[PDB]
């Protein structure tokens, strides 16, 4: 299905916007 991929990766950013709040915290206490 072409027109219904909204948003695919993350599923409406549902893991990604929580995992980005975790990655700015983990980069405050680990320098890459």
Which string of DSSP letters, residue by residue, matches 1-32?
--S--TTTTTGGGTTHHHHHHHHHHHHHT---
CA distances from 16 to 2, 11, 22, 30 (A): 22, 8, 10, 20
Q: Let me know: does 14 contact 8? Beta carbons within 8 Å.
A: no
Structurally, how many domains does the chain consist of? 1
Max Cα–Cα distance, the chain, nearest Å:
42
Residues near 3 by Cβ (< 8 Å), separated by ≥ 6? Answer: none
Residue 14: give the domain boundaries.
Answer: 1-32
Tokens of 7: 């948003």
Give the span between the Cα atoms of 20 and 11, in whole angstroms: 14
Tokens of 12: 């409406």
């Amino acid at each position: 299905c072409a027109k219904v991929k909204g948003i695919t990766q993350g599923p409406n950013e549902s893991p990604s916007a929580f995992l980005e709040r975790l990655k700015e915290a983990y980069r405050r206490y680990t320098p890459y």
